[PDB]
């Protein structure tokens, strides 16, 4: 009944994929027993939370409900919270506890500089009775002191083999068939976030479950994800580089209207396509990149859509003149 994102959440260290380089390290740390303060950081949908919860459940077993405290971002997070709750949990020694407790701060990069200073002082004070674990998406918004105090662990995105294995395990445990190009388009659009994959899978499941036997074609995947198909990108680029102004404008308009295309993703795909052309001159590439970056920056502030579309067309056309 619960969504796959919550259902297929791993419960052991073995059920994590594409992170062996960190799994062997955490297994060494748990067999040695010298587990220090940890920092897990990386792009979303990678397995930091799942890995740390599995590690806590493995180290503490049933005592997990007592010696493990999870805190999230901005839970009335003044300095008062770090003064009362975390400080009491760290300082207070349980009745029948041997070892140390664990306080896991999820998405803990949203702390102010004063809050991070309080946290670094706290972790410095009681570093002998408990160990902390800080999770982050961007490791550049944390004070270098807190970073230096613990050991870092970057979570590289999931490779193709890991996501393919996981979608295979999900497929065999569910009533769905998956076409060969479907998984290719899936891996190309997801960019390596397992959460988005597990979301879009159940989405297209509920979407095209009419006879319980329909095949998930690339059309339904591109619809549910809301991403264009590379053929349309090639066609619009061809129309821009070949036809005149009015026809290319009408083609761009109809392609972005009938399918619901944003100029941002369209420009991303267009520059991805242009990245592999055999351009004879160099000034064309420079002008193209500069003008397209300017268009994207201007779109980031929400100007007049038709004007930015005409500007995209003009930049692409005036760049290819040598």
Residues that constitute the known binding site for ATP: 5-9, 17, 42-50, 137, 195
* Encoded tokens for 170: 């999900």
Instruction: Based on the shown chain and the rule CB under 6 A, indicate whether residue 46 belongs to the binding site for ligand AGS.
Output: yes
Instruction: Based on the shown chain and the rule CB under 5 A, indicate whether residue 49 belongs to the binding site for Mg ion.
Output: yes
Nearer to ligand AGS, 64 or 320 (CB): 64
Provide the CA 106 distance to its chain's centre, in angstroms: 15
List the interface residues with another protein, window 59-98 (CB under 8 A). 66, 79, 82-83, 87-88, 92-96
**Residues annotated within a binding site:** 5-9, 17, 42-50, 137, 195
Binder to another protein among 286, 303, 305, 306 (CB under 8 A)? Answer: 286
Instruction: Based on the shown chain and the rule CB under 6 A, indicate whether residue 233 belongs to the binding site for ligand AGS.
Output: no
SS3 state of residue 261: coil
Backbone angles phi, psi at 151, to 5 degrees: -95, 135
Instruction: Based on the shown chain and the rule CB under 6 A, indicate whether residue 5 belongs to the binding site for ligand AGS.
Output: yes
Q: Applying CB under 6 A, which part among 5-13, 126-134, 229-237, 285-293 lies near ligand AGS?
A: 5-13
SS3 state of residue 95: coil
Binder to another protein among 27, 28, 154, 254 (CB under 8 A)? Answer: 154
Identify the burial level of 276 via C-beta atoms within 10 angstroms of its C-beta, where 0-12 means exposed, 13-18 middle and 19 or more buried: exposed
**Dihedral, CA of residue 269, residue 272, residue 278 and residue 282, to nearest 10:** 100
| Residues forming beta bridges with residue 133, ordered by sequence position | 38, 104
Instruction: Based on the shown chain and the rule CB under 6 A, indicate whether residue 133 belongs to the binding site for ligand AGS.
Output: no
Instruction: Based on the shown chain and the rule CB under 8 A, indicate whether residue 247 belongs to the binding site for another protein.
Output: no
**What is the nearest approach in angstroms of another protein to the Cβ of residue 84?**
9
Q: Which does 195 bind (CB under 5 to 8 A by kind): Mg ion, another protein, ligand AGS, none?
A: ligand AGS
User: H-type helices in the chain, by residue range?
Assistant: 4-7, 20-32, 48-60, 64-67, 79-81, 87-91, 113-125, 144-149, 160-172, 180-190, 194-207, 218-225, 230-242, 245-258, 263-274, 283-299, 305-319
Backbone angles phi, psi at 36, to 5 degrees: -90, -175
**What is the nearest approach in angstroms of another protein to the Cβ of residue 241?**
19
The contact set with Mg ion (CB under 5 A) reads 49
The contact set with ligand AGS (CB under 6 A) reads 5, 8-10, 16-19, 44-50, 107, 137, 145, 158, 166, 194-195, 198
């Amino acid at each position: 009944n619960l969504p796959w994102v919550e259902k297929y959440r791993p419960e052991t260290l073995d059920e994590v994929y594409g992170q062996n380089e960190v799994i062997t390290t955490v297994r060494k740390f748990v067999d040695e027993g010298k587990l220090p303060h940890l920092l897990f950081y990386g792009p979303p949908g990678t397995g930091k939370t799942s890995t740390i919860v599995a590690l806590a459940r493995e180290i503490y077993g049933k005592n997990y409900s007592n010696m493990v405290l999870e805190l999230n971002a901005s839970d009335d997070r003044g300095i008062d919270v770090v003064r009362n709750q975390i400080k009491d949990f760290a300082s207070t020694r349980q009745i029948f506890s041997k070892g140390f407790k664990l306080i896991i701060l999820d998405e803990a990069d949203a702390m102010t500089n004063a809050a991070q200073n309080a946290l670094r002082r706290v972790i410095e004070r009681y570093t002998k009775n408990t160990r902390f674990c800080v999770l982050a998406n961007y490791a550049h918004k944390l004070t270098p002191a807190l970073l230096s105090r613990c050991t870092r662990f970057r979570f590289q995105p999931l490779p193709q083999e890991a996501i393919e294995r996981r979608i295979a395990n999900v497929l065999v445990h569910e009533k769905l068939k998956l076409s060969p190009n479907a998984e290719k388009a899936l891996i190309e659009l997801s960019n390596g976030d397992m959460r988005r994959v597990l979301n879009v899978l159940q989405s297209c499941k509920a979407t095209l479950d009419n006879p319980d036997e329909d095949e998930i074609s690339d059309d339904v995947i591109y619809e549910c994800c809301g991403a264009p198909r590379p053929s349309d990108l090639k066609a619009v680029l061809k129309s821009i580089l070949e036809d005149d102004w009015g026809t290319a404008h009408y083609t761009l308009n109809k392609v972005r209207s009938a399918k619901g295309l944003a100029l941002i993703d369209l420009i991303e795909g267009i520059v991805k396509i242009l990245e592999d052309y055999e351009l004879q001159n160099e000034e064309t590439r420079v002008h193209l990149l500069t003008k397209l970056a300017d268009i994207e920056y201007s779109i980031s502030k929400g100007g007049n859509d038709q004007i930015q579309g005409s500007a995209v067309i003009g930049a692409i056309k005036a760049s290819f003149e040598n």
